[PDB]
């Protein structure tokens, strides 16, 4: 029982930390997409402003 218990806990922490680390860096990805697509829209309509 405890054998396949640690089996199951690791086996699910597997498909867990997978999507988890993917989430980490897809998130910091959108973080800099934010900082950037900011300066995109921020000055598109700064020239179009004028």
């Amino acid at each position: 029982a405890m054998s396949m218990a640690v089996e199951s806990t690791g086996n699910a922490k597997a498909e867990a930390e997978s999507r988890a680390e993917a989430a980490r860096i897809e998130g910091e990805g959108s973080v800099l997409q934010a900082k950037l697509k900011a300066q995109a829209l921020a000055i598109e309509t700064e020239a179009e402003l004028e």
């Binding site: 829209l41 309509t45 700064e46 402003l49 004028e50």
Partner: protein
């Protein structure tokens, strides 16, 4: 981005403001002094009988 373009729509609408303003303003001067001279050259009793 939105701030700058719409603060400009501010200045542009200030412009379009003054355009419509003096548009109707001097159209008003037009028609008002039109009917001014109309009824003044008419005369009080003349227009009274005409109506």
């Amino acid at each position: 981005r939105v701030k700058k373009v719409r603060e400009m729509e501010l200045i542009y609408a200030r412009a379009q403001l003054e355009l419509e303003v003096s548009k109707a303003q001097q159209l008003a001067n037009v028609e008002a002094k039109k009917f001014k001279e109309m009824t003044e050259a008419l005369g009080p009793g003349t227009i009274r009988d005409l109506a």
